[PDB]
Structure formats: C-alpha cells, structure tokens
Amino acid sequence: PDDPDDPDD
Ligand code: NA
Ligand code: NA
Ligand code: NA
C-alpha cells in the first residue's frame, strides 16, 4: 500500500 506501482504494497 505504500508503493503506488506495487499492488501488494
Ligand atoms: Na501499492
Ligand atoms: Na512515499
Ligand atoms: Na515501486
């Protein structure tokens, strides 16, 4: 969730 390019984060 913290990383707008990474659906898992
Ligand atoms: Na994300
Ligand atoms: Na950030
Ligand atoms: Na990233």
Residues 1-7: contacts with CB within 8 Å, 24+ apart? none
Distance 2 CA to ligand 2 centre (A): 6
Are residues 1 and 9 in contact, defined by beta-carbon separation less than 8 angstroms? yes
DSSP 8-state secondary structure symbol assigned to residue 6: -
DSSP state of 9: -
The structure's method of determination equals: X-ray
Residue pair 8/1 in contact by the 8 Å Cβ criterion: no
CA distance 1 to 7: 7
Contact assessment for residue 3 and residue 9, using Cβ atoms and an 8 Å cutoff: yes
CA of 4 to the centre of ligand 2 (A): 8
Structure tokens at 8: 């898992």
| Ligand (nearest to CA of 7) | 1
Sequence letter at residue 9: D
